[PDB]
């Protein structure tokens, strides 16, 4: 419908400039006849999800890399894709004029945008907050009669989530994660640093903390929002590190195991919110498989855990086979879900790099690795930041796919936004990953999935400078002869009948 208005900030590629009256957007999707494919292309050179169509033909003219679809080789079903409604994201969005707010939310949540179907909601304050509150800061309130939602929830987050859900045709799944308990439940009496819950699982501190989850779900339910899932804690490993600067709550895998078994599992099960799923870990993938082995080999905890939430810092190395691969092999019936990703966290990398193709490539590369190792969903961090990567009460350190400039009522869509969109827009909930066999060693990243209705989607990422000639074979339809340009990402779609 409307193309990218590009702007360079001196990095490897462009952002797409949006304001109160103009944002780039797509027409309603349109699937062509058997024997025709659709292709969406983004390039470092500046193409942004540009649509073309071409033939799937009977004869194979390619002599290079062949990728063969193997629809009978079936893997995980996809839960979906989205991002986090932090205090920071909400403050940034709501500082735009209402028409620019509309266009930002449509970018993420409408069929004319990239069709997000997942929102992660912090339970009270995190580093991406302007202050350090919880829902129950009055001490010695073990029954949580003084539990309440502040302005950050009732004026910023909840109205924005309502607007996100109105724009989305797809059902949206909400995921909740806490950073800290009230400080009077904690060994260190503080929101951050090395500190766990007081006492031991089963006791009055552990039971109050479990009840705080139910209180949160009740308050959100009064505002007509229902959660798909909650995590047991955001980054439980972090609250064991002395001088950890952000809101945290420390758990050893043994303490998470017993907290779920004795307190959180039973408390949610006995509540009106018993259908809400519980994810464990919500932490870096180098804690697997050890963390899953500790929690899931205990039947009294394992019966309450629907899945494992993993984080990754895309700046760092983590071998997927030894972590995600091994966890799947040991616990093949407990879904893996990427609950948080971000980039820029290294000292020498600027927090926000407007138009960084490399950061885009890190997003798409990480989504393909995840999908190739059984992960069912991928959730970005902050939906939007300011050009300094804020607000953050501790320190700005990561990027965001949308950067808001309130002084100009403008927002910038980064390459990360398009690299995410090449998946989120074209892989609806219930899509299943299927085989895609490479005929020979190659430098592309590729993944194939089948839509619920049986149609094919293949994403091809070229992180090299060299054009790669490519053929895709669908045994049912024929040969797609294509080129993966250097520093490109392609999404291919086609009917199989
Ligand atoms: C919002 O962005 C749009 C698109 O860049 C701007 O629209 C244009 O306005 C210029 C100068 O006024 C015209 O010559 C162009 O033809 C317009 N382009 C399009 C494609 O409509 C608009 O200026 C921006 N709004 C503000 C207040 O800067
Ligand atoms: C709740 O807040 C009120 C008003 O400040 C306070 O007086 C009361 O002590 C709190 N209630 C409980 C149960 O802690």
Swiss-Prot record:
Outcome of mutating residue 370 to S: In GD1; risk factor for Parkinson disease; increased proteasomal degradation; decreased protein abundance; decreased glucosylceramide catabolic process; decreased glucosylceramidase activity; 23% of normal activity when expressed in a heterologous system; alters interaction with saposin-C
Name the consequence of residue 216 to Y: In GD; loss of glucosylceramidase activity;
Quote the annotated effect of residue 462 to D.
Loss of glucosylceramidase activity
- pH dependence of function: Optimum pH is 5.3.
Part of which pathway? Steroid metabolism; cholesterol metabolism; Sphingolipid metabolism
- Outcome of mutating residue 456 to P: In GD1; loss of glucosylceramidase activity
User: Per the record, what is the consequence of mutating residue 182 to L?
Assistant: In GD1; very low glucosylceramidase activity
Q: Which family does it belong to?
A: Belongs to the glycosyl hydrolase 30 family.
Protein name in the entry? Lysosomal acid glucosylceramidase
Protein source organism: Homo sapiens (Human)
């Amino acid at each position: 419908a409307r193309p990218c208005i590009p702007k360079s900030f001196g990095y490897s590629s462009v952002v797409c400039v949006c304001n109160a009256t103009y944002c780039d957007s797509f027409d309603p999707p349109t699937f062509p006849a058997l024997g025709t494919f659709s292709r969406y292309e983004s390039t470092r050179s500046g193409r942004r999800m540009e649509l073309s169509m071409g033939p799937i033909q009977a004869n194979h003219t390619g002599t290079g890399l062949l990728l063969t679809l193997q629809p009978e080789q079936k893997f995980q079903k996809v839960k979906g894709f989205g991002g986090a409604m932090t205090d920071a994201a909400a403050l940034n969005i709501l500082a735009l004029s209402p028409p620019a707010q509309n266009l930002l939310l449509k970018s993420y949540f409408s069929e004319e945008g990239i069709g997000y179907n997942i929102i992660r909601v912090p339970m009270a304050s995190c580093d991406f907050s302007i202050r350090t509150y919880t829902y129950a800061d009055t001490p010695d309130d073990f029954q949580l009669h003084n539990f309440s939602l502040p302005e950050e929830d009732t004026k910023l987050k909840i109205p924005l989530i309502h607007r996100a859900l109105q724009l989305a045709q797809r059902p949206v799944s909400l995921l909740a994660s806490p950073w800290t308990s009230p400080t009077w439940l904690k060994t260190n009496g503080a929101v951050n640093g090395k500190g766990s819950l007081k006492g031991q699982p089963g006791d009055i501190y552990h039971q109050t903390w479990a009840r705080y989850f139910v209180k949160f779900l009740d308050a959100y339910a009064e505002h007509k929002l229902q959660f798909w899932a909650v995590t047991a804690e955001n980054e439980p490993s972090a609250g064991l590190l002395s001088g950890y600067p952000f809101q945290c709550l420390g758990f050893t895998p043994e303490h998470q195991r017993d907290f779920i078994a004795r307190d959180l599992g039973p408390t949610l099960a006995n509540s009106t919110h018993h259908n809400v799923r519980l994810l464990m870990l919500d932490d870096q993938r180098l804690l697997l498989p050890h963390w899953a082995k500790v929690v899931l080999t205990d039947p009294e905890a394992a019966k309450y855990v629907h899945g494992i939430a993993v984080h990754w810092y895309l700046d760092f190395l983590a071998p997927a086979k030894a972590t995600l691969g091994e966890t799947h092999r040991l616990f093949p019936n407990t879904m893996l879900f990427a609950s948080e990703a971000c980039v820029g966290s290294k000292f020498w990398e600027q927090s926000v790099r407007l138009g960084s193709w490399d950061r885009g490539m890190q997003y798409s590369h990480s989504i393909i690795t995840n999908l190739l190792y059984h992960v069912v969903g991928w959730t970005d961090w902050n939906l939007a930041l300011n050009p300094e990567g804020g607000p953050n009460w501790v320190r700005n350190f990561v990027d965001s796919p949308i950067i808001v400039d309130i002084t100009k009522d403008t927002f910038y869509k980064q390459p990360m936004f398009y690299h995410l969109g090449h998946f989120s827009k074209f892989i609806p909930e219930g899509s299943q990953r299927v085989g895609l066999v490479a005929s020979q060693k190659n430098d592309l990243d590729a993944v194939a999935l089948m839509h619920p209705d049986g149609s094919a989607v293949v994403v091809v990422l070229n992180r090299s400078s060299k054009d790669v000639p490519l053929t895709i074979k669908d045994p049912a339809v024929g040969f797609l002869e294509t080129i993966s340009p250097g520093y490109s990402i392609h999404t291919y779609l086609w009917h199989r009948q």
